[PDB]
Amino acid sequence: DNFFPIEKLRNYTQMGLIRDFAKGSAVIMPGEEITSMIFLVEGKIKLDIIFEDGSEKLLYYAGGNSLIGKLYPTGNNIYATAMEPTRTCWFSEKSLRTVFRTDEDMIFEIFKNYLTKVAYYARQVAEMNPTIRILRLFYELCSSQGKRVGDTYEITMPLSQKSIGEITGVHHVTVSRVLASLKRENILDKKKNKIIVYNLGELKHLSE
Amino acid sequence: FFPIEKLRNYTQMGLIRDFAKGSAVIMPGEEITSMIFLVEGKIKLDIIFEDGSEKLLYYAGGNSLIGKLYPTGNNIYATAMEPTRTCWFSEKSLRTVFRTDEDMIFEIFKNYLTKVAYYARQVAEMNTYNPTIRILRLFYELCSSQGKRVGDTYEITMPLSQKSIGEITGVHHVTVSRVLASLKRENILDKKKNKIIVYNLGELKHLS
Ligand SMILES: O=C(O)Cc1ccc(O)c(Cl)c1
Ligand SMILES: O=C(O)Cc1ccc(O)c(Cl)c1
Numbered sequence A: 001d002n003f004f005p006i007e008k009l010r011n012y013t014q015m016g017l018i019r020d021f022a023k024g025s026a027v028i029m030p031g032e033e034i035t036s037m038i039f040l041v042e043g044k045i046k047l048d049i050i051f052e053d054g055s056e057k058l059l060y061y062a063g064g065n066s067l068i069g070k071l072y073p074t075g076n077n078i079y080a081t082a083m084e085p086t087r088t089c090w091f092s093e094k095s096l097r098t099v100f101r102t103d104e105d106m107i108f109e110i111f112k113n114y115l116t117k118v119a120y121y122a123r124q125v126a127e128m129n130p131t132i133r134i135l136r137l138f139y140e141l142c143s144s145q146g147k148r149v150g151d152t153y154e155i156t157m158p159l160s161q162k163s164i165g166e167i168t169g170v171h172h173v174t175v176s177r178v179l180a181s182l183k184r185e186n187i188l189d190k191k192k193n194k195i196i197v198y199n200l201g202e203l204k205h206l207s208e
Numbered sequence B: 001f002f003p004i005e006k007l008r009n010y011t012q013m014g015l016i017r018d019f020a021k022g023s024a025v026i027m028p029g030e031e032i033t034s035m036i037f038l039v040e041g042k043i044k045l046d047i048i049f050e051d052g053s054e055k056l057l058y059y060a061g062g063n064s065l066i067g068k069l070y071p072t073g074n075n076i077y078a079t080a081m082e083p084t085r086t087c088w089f090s091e092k093s094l095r096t097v098f099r100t101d102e103d104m105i106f107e108i109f110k111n112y113l114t115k116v117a118y119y120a121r122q123v124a125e126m127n128t129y130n131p132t133i134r135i136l137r138l139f140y141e142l143c144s145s146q147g148k149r150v151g152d153t154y155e156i157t158m159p160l161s162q163k164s165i166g167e168i169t170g171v172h173h174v175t176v177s178r179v180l181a182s183l184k185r186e187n188i189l190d191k192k193k194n195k196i197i198v199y200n201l202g203e204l205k206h207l208s
Helices: A007-015 A093-102 A105-127 A132-145 A161-168 A172-184 A200-207 B005-013 B091-100 B103-125 B132-146 B162-169 B173-185 B201-207
Strands: A017-021 A026-028 A036-042 A044-050 A056-063 A077-082 A086-092 A147-149 A152-156 A188-190 A194-197 B015-019 B024-026 B035-040 B043-048 B054-060 B075-080 B084-089 B154-157 B189-192 B195-198
Touching: A007 A036, A007 A086, A007 A093, A007 A105, A044 A086, A044 B103, A056 A077, A056 B103, A086 A093, A093 A105, A093 B103, A105 B043, A105 B054, A105 B103, A132 A152, A132 A161, A132 A172, A132 A194, A132 A200, A132 B162, A161 A172, A161 B132, A161 B162, A172 A188, B005 B035, B005 B084, B005 B091, B005 B103, B084 B091, B091 B103, B132 B154, B132 B162, B132 B173, B132 B195, B132 B201, B162 B173, B173 B189
Parallel strands: none
Antiparallel strands: A017 A086, A026 A077, A036 A086, A044 A056, A044 A077, A147 A152, A152 A194, A188 A194, B015 B084, B024 B075, B035 B084, B043 B054, B043 B075, B154 B195, B189 B195
């Protein structure tokens, strides 16, 4: 929710383009290339990221005085919709120059807003041992679905690393590291249609 | 993140500070009110949490910008990994830069936006704001690979406690209880003793 509302932007809306949106209309469309900052004069906007597989995850809720800082291409596919009657002011690069030439302080208000967002998201990435969750998942899977094949358990299941990451809330880069380490230590080998457990005892132990 | 090589043209407007390998660019608890341009060298920048736990935020090299012009309320610690030359730009000294070249405002916006785009995508990937989804995904994966079809239903044989579901998915046990109760009420899935019955795989697949 609310990011360093830029309330002083209220005074410069005459220098951008007003765009009003009815409840449920898409303020940003999937694959729409936005090259404007969007000021929320009043309303509520829900902004999501759409990953390259079509999953749609919430980033934030924007309300009165919020700034959507999407002045340039980002590599994230964004989809934003109005959740009430929303009035917005759109500020292209050209119109921001007009703002800065009137009031230089506005450059620093916008820095503060971006800075608030980096501080917020970076801290959350950091806040989130998540590794134990992958071990608990393999342990529960092995102990109920695992078939004894000589001195190994086999779980017949196409469980992609993407699915492991989604189930456990573990970043896709940590999943691959955990699995590499599991293989190297002769514990578990996560192949394509099967998972092979060589050491159920140590797996149980690591997981508890 | 977007490097700002052009800021090398304006270091005479800032304060040059050199750091030896291993020395602190930013000290624990230091109040930073300057952007820090890395002319040459290499910096590791960590967040320090209130328990004393330290976590990487990023590595920075040639032409990188540390955007900490205002207090954020994170405790940050940043060390030189090699001998490093830096240029410190206060708000005043940044105003002198922008009076000379208005485009440096927008170069800094791009740098900031690249950082929000990077951290926000990571937060979004991990379903931080909709962690219930990790539960649906667990059930969906289990059913699609281990489910046996019985009329218009699937049976999975799996002793799985709510405490286990929460430990696997990183989801609070109260949310776990609420999700299992709603699944059963909506006739989607029921976990009856050691058997998971899915009545509506299609709907469970849709939700996850
Ligand atoms: O567009 C992006 O990739 C991320 C994003 C979304 C909304 C914002 O207000 C910002 Cl600064 C960035
Ligand atoms: O200081 C912070 O809280 C986060 C931070 C760290 C480094 C940076 O370059 C930025 Cl823009 C923010």
